[PDB]
Design an enzyme around this catalytic site. Sequence first.
Site, short mmCIF file in Angstrom:
data_model
loop_
_atom_site.label_atom_id
_atom_site.label_comp_id
_atom_site.label_asym_id
_atom_site.label_seq_id
_atom_site.Cartn_x
_atom_site.Cartn_y
_atom_site.Cartn_z
N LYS A 162 45.20 39.00 40.68
CA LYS A 162 45.01 40.44 40.72
C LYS A 162 44.53 40.89 42.09
O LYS A 162 45.06 41.85 42.66
CB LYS A 162 44.03 40.86 39.64
CG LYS A 162 44.08 42.33 39.33
CD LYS A 162 43.44 42.62 37.99
CE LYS A 162 42.75 43.96 37.98
NZ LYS A 162 41.60 43.99 38.92
N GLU A 189 31.59 48.18 39.09
CA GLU A 189 31.94 46.99 39.85
C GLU A 189 30.78 46.02 39.83
O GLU A 189 29.67 46.37 40.25
CB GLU A 189 32.30 47.37 41.28
CG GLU A 189 32.77 46.23 42.14
CD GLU A 189 34.21 45.87 41.88
OE1 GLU A 189 34.67 46.05 40.73
OE2 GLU A 189 34.89 45.41 42.81
N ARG A 190 31.02 44.80 39.35
CA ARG A 190 30.01 43.77 39.48
C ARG A 190 29.66 43.59 40.94
O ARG A 190 30.53 43.57 41.81
CB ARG A 190 30.51 42.45 38.91
CG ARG A 190 30.71 42.45 37.43
CD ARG A 190 31.10 41.06 36.97
NE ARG A 190 31.68 41.04 35.63
CZ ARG A 190 32.85 41.56 35.31
NH1 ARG A 190 33.59 42.15 36.23
NH2 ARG A 190 33.28 41.50 34.07
#
Lengths: 469, 467, 53, 486, 128
Positions: B154, B180-181
């Site tokens: 991805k 978002e981590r």
Amino acid sequence: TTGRIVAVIGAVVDVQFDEGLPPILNALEVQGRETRLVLEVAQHLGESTVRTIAMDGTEGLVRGQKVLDSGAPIRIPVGPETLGRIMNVIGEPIDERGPIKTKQFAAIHAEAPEFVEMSVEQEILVTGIKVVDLLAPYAKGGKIGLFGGAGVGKTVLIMELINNVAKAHGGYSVFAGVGERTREGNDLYHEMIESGVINLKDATSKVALVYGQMNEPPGARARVALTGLTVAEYFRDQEGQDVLLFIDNIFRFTQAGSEVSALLGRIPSAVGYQPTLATDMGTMQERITTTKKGSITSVQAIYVPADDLTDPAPATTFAHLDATTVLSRAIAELGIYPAVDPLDSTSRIMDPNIVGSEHYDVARGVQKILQDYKSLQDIIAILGMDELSEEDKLTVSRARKIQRFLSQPFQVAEVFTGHLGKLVPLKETIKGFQQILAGEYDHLPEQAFYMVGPIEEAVAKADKLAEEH
Amino acid sequence: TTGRIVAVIGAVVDVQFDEGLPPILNALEVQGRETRLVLEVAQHLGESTVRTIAMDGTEGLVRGQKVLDSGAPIRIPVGPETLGRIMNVIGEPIDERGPIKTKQFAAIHAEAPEFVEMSVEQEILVTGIKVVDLLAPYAKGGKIGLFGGAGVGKTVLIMELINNVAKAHGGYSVFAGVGERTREGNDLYHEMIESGVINLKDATSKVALVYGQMNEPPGARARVALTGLTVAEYFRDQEGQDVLLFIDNIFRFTQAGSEVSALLGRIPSAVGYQPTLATDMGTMQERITTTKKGSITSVQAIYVPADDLTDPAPATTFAHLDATTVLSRAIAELGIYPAVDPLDSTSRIMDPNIVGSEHYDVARGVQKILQDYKSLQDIIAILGMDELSEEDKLTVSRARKIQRFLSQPFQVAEVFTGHLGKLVPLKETIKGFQQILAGEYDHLPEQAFYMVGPIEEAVAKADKLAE
Amino acid sequence: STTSEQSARMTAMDNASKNASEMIDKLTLTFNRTRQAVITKELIEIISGAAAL
Amino acid sequence: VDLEETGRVLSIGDGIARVHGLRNVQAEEMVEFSSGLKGMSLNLEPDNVGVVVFGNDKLIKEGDIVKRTGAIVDVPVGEELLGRVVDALGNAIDGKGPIGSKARRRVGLKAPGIIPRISVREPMQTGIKAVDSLVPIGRGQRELIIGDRQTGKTSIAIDTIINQKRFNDGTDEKKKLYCIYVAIGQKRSTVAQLVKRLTDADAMKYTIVVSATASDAAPLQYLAPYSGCSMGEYFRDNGKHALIIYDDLSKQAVAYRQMSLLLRRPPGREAYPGDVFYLHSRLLERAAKMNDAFGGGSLTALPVIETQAGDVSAYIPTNVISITDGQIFLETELFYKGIRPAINVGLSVSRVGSAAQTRAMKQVAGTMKLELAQYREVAAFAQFGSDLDAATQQLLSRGVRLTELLKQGQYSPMAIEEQVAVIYAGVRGYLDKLEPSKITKFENAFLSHVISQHQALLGKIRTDGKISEESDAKLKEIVTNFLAGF
Amino acid sequence: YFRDNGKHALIIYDDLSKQAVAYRQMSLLLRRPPGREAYPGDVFYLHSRLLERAAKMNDAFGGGSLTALPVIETQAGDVSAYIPTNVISITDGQIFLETELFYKGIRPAINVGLSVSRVGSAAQTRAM
Ligand SMILES: Nc1ncnc2c1ncn2[C@@H]1O[C@H](COP(=O)(O)OP(=O)(O)OP(=O)(O)O)[C@@H](O)[C@H]1O
Ligand SMILES: Nc1ncnc2c1ncn2[C@@H]1O[C@H](COP(=O)(O)OP(=O)(O)O)[C@@H](O)[C@H]1O
Ligand SMILES: Nc1ncnc2c1ncn2[C@@H]1O[C@H](COP(=O)(O)OP(=O)(O)O)[C@@H](O)[C@H]1O
Ligand SMILES: [Mg+2]
Ligand SMILES: [Mg+2]
């Protein structure tokens, strides 16, 4: 102090005071009642009002009645005089034999033992039941749970445990019945009186019954557990002796709280339960414990609403037990009694160090063979059983034999089965299951093992079936 | 004008103005914080009180703190100096690399381009990736779902799209990492720096990163998508060019909106989602379009809750998707990259009117042959290969060659493959697949097609592998 | 007969697997619908209790 | 009378005091009641304040006087906690005396940003073959342990804690790892037996057990994870490596839900407030791996979640599955058919992957993963077994052996080199000629044999961190010689 | 307007499943008590009152007419969901567009098994 009732809604009474205000958990006596009505305070709503839960039916209350603050939480008699009696939630006797004359009173609300007071010893407690002793051995001083749907064997099993252990126990015992049938309470009382455990004439009783059966309004069913727990607390601490504590049911202790919660003004939680379910249960289950200054071998029956072990109530209780024996309806349909589910009952002492290598190996072998059988049933769905290989037909046959052998006839079930109750010491169970696994009984029919005690009795029954054939 | 915080309940702060209230959606700055806390107005409760949602932690807010009304919605810098810079929802740079210097400021709450501004001809963004551009072509000003989780390519695919669009179109890209981590955000930043799309020295970065972290109150994760759209809208209108807009993840956008609505105290909708789910999605998705100045093409990573494609979140999202790309593990195992699944991938513009008759016919032919090979794989796996007709074996050969031909080398995954990256233009891809299908290349080995650009390069490989 | 029987079992079990999958399609759709209905119903009960007090 | 630094309780009940006054109280600040009880001020409304009481409300009458302490909640930290049992606020509950920690930290501090971190690259050795080979855990990761009841999650955590003893007893300083075990909503006797178990393995000289048990008021159970995470951030921010184990994170969510529903905040799904994501995300995002400019320390996290009926689509399980870098499923079906630890290796993942595996374990587990992947897709035949070609027959004869290598026992973690040796024997093929039931015995024998005689080879594997072709050949010789005489 | 001035009109609502969602938003934001699928109990009257205007006036009333072609969208092709049945009991027919006939290239994908028109043969050219 002295307040006046200001509102009555269901079992929730709001009381207004002008003197000092009674702290939470205090007991307030309603003045002008034929029978003692005690309201337990539960909230301070401001304006010198307190919301309260009535321990007894609120019929006939009038706005403005007078209410006297007792000054301390519900206090109950304790001591070795309560043995052989029956008590309310509020401690007053309900067996019609005069007052419980004690020196000691105890408040039913008290903090739990601190972390520095816990015990860490574990020794198996032989019960005489094959399945319980083999797969989920109980432990002295440990908390034990019987998770059941409706009508699976919780009460018969707990009566069997009473008969077995309480009779052969050096210490005392307590049976707090929380919100279950009154027929059962009377049955137990008469069974004990006729079995010598209770003694009406002299002071030689070893059981202190407490009853909050299901006709009591929710304020009462939610507290009788604490009352039985207080009696057991005393016997554990002051007498400095071992104690037993059977509770049946411990779901009703949660159900009653749920019943009053909405009227107490709380938004409901997941499944309609009170938002405080987890803590309202921890503050109770944390007092039922062994400590360095005593020991309680608590057993508790637990309703599982609609056989749904994922319900919030049983799901939350699972974390508070040292050993669970999940009775199952599916097994009870096969006629195996007790219906204990071998692949769902667990324990904390089922270790090779605490129970021994051979016991552990046999227990794990039983579980593994039953699980393999569960997997094979799926194939038997389509193939039929003639098509199964010859290493699996053996597995299925052995698994059926083990399923049958886990059943046993209890002494309190003679009315149903007619058979004679049996006790199977630990060695007999381990040896019999070793032999069944090894293959030393492939020549006996499976029905030879149905409802028998030790293995030798299965052999004798097989011989009798053959002869009468 | 300055109001006073009157209430502070979790992430919801109620402020009380005295002269004049700020219109809804304005940004208010709380005075007295070491960091900069911005409250976005959400309601006008009456009595000159406004209920607002905080963009940061509301720990330490006293009842009475002074709150200055900024005077317009959250405003961020949208120059071309954002490129290569990470910024958070309120516009601050979170890469501790110095302030973002721009001469332009944009308010993140805009409105969809009017009906007259809409473009009416449906074009086809050329990403330069063969599989994406043949079976599931992307459309300018269209939304593109991206299924497939981790381990499938991805991030490498995102980087390749960024590079190819910046190279073959001159259009920059924005990456709005909603929810978002922090670990994954840092990894993405460093992967981009390594792969050249971001460059920390020569001011030729092709990406503007916006990060709404996963540890920010819901009021912030629900607006970062709008910060991304603001930057990209600048690149479209004030610089008249096509833009890419990656949104990872799009589910976390709807979830953040749901939490904000619950906090405000709104009755949850069908499955706990906010009542305003449809229009919350619409206001955002409806600014990703191809107006008369430029276009924003959005690639939206999609998570499907409970593997349920009828869940209100994906159900609402899929009403806007103009295409789908399904990265599948089962094709990373086979060594074909990108893992794009040629059959699950779909597109709205697979219409002879939109893409043309020859393109449509080639794509249909490839799909038909691949379906046939998929069906015959079972028979080969059961009845054996020796019992297939000549035509069946020929289709198997064609299908294997086409499968290998869909694989391409990416200029950003050189360090993995080592092969120099290629950018296959559309017409060359159509020509190559026309030739392969017609049978012109029945006389070449399968491996001659693995990881090659145009077809002529495949022919060159076929020669060089027998010399 | 042995060859014929084995071919017939192949075909029969293939048809049975296809029938089972075609049934699992509908059962999965129903399961997802019922799961969402349960979530919505529980949520509505909670909020209706909250509003009532 | 003072109504800025002091206030008076309007109401109380179910643990949520409603105070009047305290006009200068900050949100999430620790006030103190006249009865020696603390509380945390959560709801600041125009007319009152909602204080959650850290303890029993029996002692909080109406009209009491509440005085603000002026500080946000803070907990002690330092190496003075190691080996102690503290409660959700740093108070010792093991009765060994006062904690005596100089420093303090705020429980609600923020996580490190985007630049301070660096990609997770060190291996955090759990001492469990299945975890260490198939679902590895790096330092700075957040690896959820998600399972049903009594499947073995707490045992995974305790094996991890016990294993670090080999590193902490050595002299290498960047391999030392300090463990913290936050026990939320657990019967006290469980924590007491756990502390005894850790003492037995002598793993309690570098462990901090934070205890928020069932009896504790809801705020203490809601606050324990943050206390533990702060005591762990202290080691992270000082060049040391920490490992915090929340057990469980579902019970923190339940306690938070109780607090909210009693403060009357809008319910939301399953009655969970809208912050049960923010709650857990802003906790688990503090497990980082600082770059050398910030010390180089790290802080791993292993949140434990219980799933009802293997339902991992519930609210909290999915909230915590979308926050973490992996998951280790523990199915009970596998537990009862001999596979213990019951780590379902199909559903388990680690988005970090093999980037956090020692070169030797990479060398071996890289192929073990593929062998098990191939086995898992022909597992159904296992019953039929015959009637199939030699291809699938050999596939599911290798898979069974590989599976039986991954079985392990309570509280007996294995050194990485020993796991590598066992998996090497098993996967290179020196076991396919062995009846599966005996595999375990072979292991338990082979291991010991290698430990006794060939310690030098294990030392070389441990130090080089790789299986050099010389070491590879020597290991093949050892395996062949032993397997010959069995 | 046309229908009442003697002319003939055709109105195509596209979709009516995305009006009921807007109405559900409006209601839930008004705090009205949600019902089945969170839709208000009113969600029927909303469509019934709208589609009951597609009438056909007799010659003594001008003779105009107003055909209506509501377009409903069903998740996973569940014809028995709430809104689809609300509208199937308001209209005079239906054209079911299968999503598997469509994927077979059979377009338009009318599922003639389930499609029906409850005026049908009436008002059809005799030749047809
Ligand atoms: N690796 C293992 N080998 C053998 N037995 C194990 C292993 N791991 C766990 N068990 C057994 O499983 C039982 C439950 O273990 P454990 O307490 O770790 O599960 P749990 O999920 O923590 O339980 P709970 O959910 O009730 O806290 C223990 O009695 C233990 O003996
Ligand atoms: N050991 C047993 N042997 C035979 N029958 C049993 C046994 N245990 C339970 N049963 C049957 O199942 C019923 C379950 O009732 P009981 O266990 O007393 O109530 P509960 O619903 O609390 O389990 C009994 O009435 C009895 O008929
Ligand atoms: N075109 C390609 N060439 C070589 N390797 C690839 C390609 N696409 C994906 N990969 C491999 O697949 C892995 C997937 O990782 P990546 O896509 O970067 O993160 P994520 O899995 O989170 O999307 C990469 O490590 C990469 O080595
Ligand atoms: Mg009963
Ligand atoms: Mg545990």
